[PDB]
Amino acid sequence: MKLLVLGTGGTIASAKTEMGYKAALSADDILQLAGIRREDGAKIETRDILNLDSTLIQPEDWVTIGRAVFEAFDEYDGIVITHGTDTLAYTSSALSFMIRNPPIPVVLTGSMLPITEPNSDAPRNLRTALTFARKGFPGIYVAFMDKIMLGTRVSKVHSLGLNAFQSINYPDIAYVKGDEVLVRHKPRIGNGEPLFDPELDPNVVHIRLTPGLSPEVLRAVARATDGIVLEGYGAGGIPYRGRNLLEVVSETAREKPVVMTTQALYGGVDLTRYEVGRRALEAGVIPAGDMTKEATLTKLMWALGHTRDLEEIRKIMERNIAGEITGS
């Protein structure tokens, strides 16, 4: 049993020196301060690849993290990645599209408090991630508190509480209690060979449809990006009265993908349900179904990295690649 811990930064790593310097402690220091390891059965190796506040994460970093994960598939039985919470769900989603048929568990985790703080959540989060890394099953997951969640189905829903990450429109995968994994839902696990497929187009923009959003703004946005995620109300639709945003969307969607998700946290979209939705479909809008906002964005980046054909972008967005979207 050999596990790799990949360190990438985040609050979990934050520490001050005796002279005031602000350091991002290494994966080895983190495990030590968490009280992990001091024993075998499972050999734990460590590597540090980045030291970022996860606010600063860019899509090029997903390629770096992804390359390190995929190359580790030869040597290890499980992987845990320590990462900032701010963009944890974006990295977990993007890695799920960039890496097909992972042969081992790959578990991202972080904490809301620094490991150096005395009531830190980091020790618990690491234990949960490591227990699943050694006893769980293949795929890309996020560990937080005692929960294991599908990487394409998580969001950061609290900015302050310890229970900061939830699974959205999809059940929790498993819970860790002591050294046991209690499985709630095992996803479909692809028998195929591991594939690394990193091409993505980072030039996408995520905008909220709001009363008062002007045609002019949406035009300015459309001319400066390659893809748009619109965050609509409820089941989804586009305003056409007074500020006719539908007209801007039908023109844009001739040349670039426009994907619609919802402002709601739960339930996703259904553009079939209302006329405002149906007009949106007629104008070329791609529905995000029940996908998280993180998964919608990273999947579109991944789509655009593989094609500029609008019909093939539609097929990719609506096909279930790695558990991100409910099908039929």
Which residues between 233 and 272 bind its own copies (CB under 8 A)? 233-243, 262-270
Nearer CB in complex with its own copies: 78/231: 231
**Main-chain dihedrals φ then ψ at residue 106, nearest 5 degrees:** -120, 110
Residue 298 to residue 277: CA distance in whole angstroms: 23
Q: Is residue 11 among the annotated active site residues? A: yes
How far is residue 49 from each of residues 8, 116, 191, measured CA to CA in Å? 6, 21, 29
Residues 138-197 that bind its own copies (CB under 8 A): 155-161, 164
Least CB distance to its own copies at residue 106 (A): 19
Q: Which of 8, 46, 82, 85 is catalytic?
A: 85
Using CB under 8 A as the binding rule, the residues of this chain from 282 to 321 that contact its own copies are 293, 297, 301
Consult the annotation and say whether 111 binds a ligand. Answer: no
Site string for its own copies, 30-69 (x = CB under 8 A): ----------------------xxxxxxxxx---------
- Catalytic residue check, 85: yes
175, 203, 323 from 141: Cα distances, Å: 12, 26, 11
Please pick, from the candidates 210, 312, 318, 319, the single residue that binds its own copies as defined by CB under 8 A: 210
Burial grade of 96 (CB within 10 A; 0-12, 13-18, 19 or more): buried
CB of 172 closer than 8 Å to CB of 149: yes
Pair 92, 65: CB distance under 8 Å: no
CB 68, min distance to its own copies, A: 18
Q: Which of 216, 255, 309, 312 binds its own copies (CB under 8 A)?
A: 216
Q: Would you name the residues annotated as active-site residues?
A: 11, 85-86, 156, 274
